[PDB]
């Protein structure tokens, strides 16, 4: 579950922290919020390697572009470079991104699909839990949201995904990009899925495991 | 004809108090036929340890490839590569073969020589990094290892206690998988000493 919500003086994006490997949870606390540039952040859903690789590549080329032009990078530049890359690979790079940020032009919120189609909106949701999140966004969203209202709506939209979607779970990551301010990355903004104390300690008596051989390994030169 | 489950095998890595452990089984087979009971899946480049499960040809190939790259790294940088850096090199190298990948589930384990922080990481076959505080699992008995690790594991274990936990996690997971077992090796890694132990397990 990933969402983006526009507000008064900027844009906020949020994501859950569950990484799956079929029905198995591989990572209970993975970071789906990626930095393309200091004030342009990207929420990624779909093929995990593809979202990271495509976000890092465009982030690299945006940095070189920003140095070349002596200008702060624009969201439309990251949007254009991502969509042209994804389109060229005809959907085989399974990256579904919500791109947001602030630049000299203002605050922006976009979504990109694996095939290279882009959408504009005040509120967006992508991933397996997008329908659970979009239900909340469609119910509670309004024009002229404050910063604190947009964070609440975004985290509520992710929570809908966490609880109701089996694909989504664990924690809520948030990034706030406000105009005229530094972007604040709120890693584990909410942690409503803390593991309860175990009933028993499974610390074994020393010598429980049968050993055949011991040897010192040489790591030094 | 599923490359990731022809040869079979498992790797598991755990963190402890100022230590890390990485373990692997020794089985190499061709489906039902067990062929080798000496096929180790853990390699090291200086103080950084890499376990690799999956297609055995790609395990051998990637070992030779990372030895190649870490040797050049060291000549140019004039220092040993660190686990955090090596993790990024593995991810880079796997994603380079995005549309013709190595059929592997690699696992990085080691202690940063500067900060002294224990570090483990896991990857999918196209280089997605799975960083973890607690444990990383890989192989044909990954479901079994996930169950054992999630129940047995507790934070800040001493090297001697961590050894028992990782060993019991691997052994009991391997005994519920046909394509895993046939022997096991456990590496206990402290800041400046590494102990390697061969476990006695059932040979069926």
């Amino acid at each position: 579950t990933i969402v983006g919500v526009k507000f008064n003086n900027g844009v906020v994006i949020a994501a859950d922290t569950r990484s799956t490997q079929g029905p198995i949870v591989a990572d209970k606390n993975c970071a789906k919020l990626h930095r393309i540039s200091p004030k342009i952040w990207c929420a990624g859903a779909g093929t995990a390697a593809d979202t990271e690789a495509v976000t890092q590549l465009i982030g690299s080329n945006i940095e070189l572009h920003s140095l070349y032009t002596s200008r702060e990078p624009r969201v439309v530049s990251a949007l254009q470079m991502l969509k042209q890359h994804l389109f060229k690979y005809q959907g085989h790079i399974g990256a579904y991104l919500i791109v947001a940020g602030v630049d000299p032009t203002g605050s922006h919120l976009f979504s990109i699909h694996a095939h290279g189609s882009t959408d504009v909106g005040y509120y967006l949701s992508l991933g397996s839990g997008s329908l659970a999140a979009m239900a909340v966004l469609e119910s509670h969203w309004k024009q002229d949201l404050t910063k604190e209202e947009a964070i609440k709506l975004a985290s509520d939209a992710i929570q809908a995904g966490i609880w109701n979607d089996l694909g989504s779970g664990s924690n809520v990551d948030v990034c706030v990009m406000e105009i005229g301010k530094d972007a604040e990355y709120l890693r584990n903004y909410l942690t409503p899925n803390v593991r309860e104390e175990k009933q028993k300690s499974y610390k074994f008596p020393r010598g429980t495991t049968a050993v055949l051989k011991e040897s010192i390994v040489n790591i030094c030169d | 004809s599923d490359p990731s489950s022809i040869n079979g095998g498992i790797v598991v890595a755990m963190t402890g108090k100022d230590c890390v452990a990485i373990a692997c089984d020794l089985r190499l087979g061709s489906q039902s036929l067990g062929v080798s009971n000496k096929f180790e899946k853990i390699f090291h480049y200086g103080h950084v340890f890499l376990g690799i499960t999956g297609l055995a040809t790609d395990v051998t190939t990637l070992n030779e490839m990372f030895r190649y790259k870490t040797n050049l790294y060291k000549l140019k940088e004039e220092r040993a590569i660190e686990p955090e850096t090596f993790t990024q090199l593995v991810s880079s190298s796997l994603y380079e073969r995005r549309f013709g990948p190595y059929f592997v589930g690699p696992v990085v384990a080691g202690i940063n020589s500067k900060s002294g922080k224990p570090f483990i990481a896991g990857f999918d076959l196209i280089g997605c990094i799975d960083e973890a505080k607690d444990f990383i699992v890989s192989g044909t008995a990954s479901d079994q290892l996930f169950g054992m690790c999630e129940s047995l594991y507790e934070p800040n274990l001493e090297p001697e206690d961590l050894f028992e936990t990782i060993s019991q996690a691997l052994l009991n997971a391997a005994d519920r998988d046909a394509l895993s077992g046939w022997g096991a090796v456990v590496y206990i890694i402290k800041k400046d000493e590494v102990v390697k132990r061969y476990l006695k397990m059932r040979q069926d």
Binding site: T20, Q21, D27, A45, A48, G129, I158, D165, S168 | -
Partner: peptide, 5 residues
């Protein structure tokens, strides 16, 4: 397997 919210 691959890793895939």
């Amino acid at each position: 397997x691959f890793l895939f919210x």
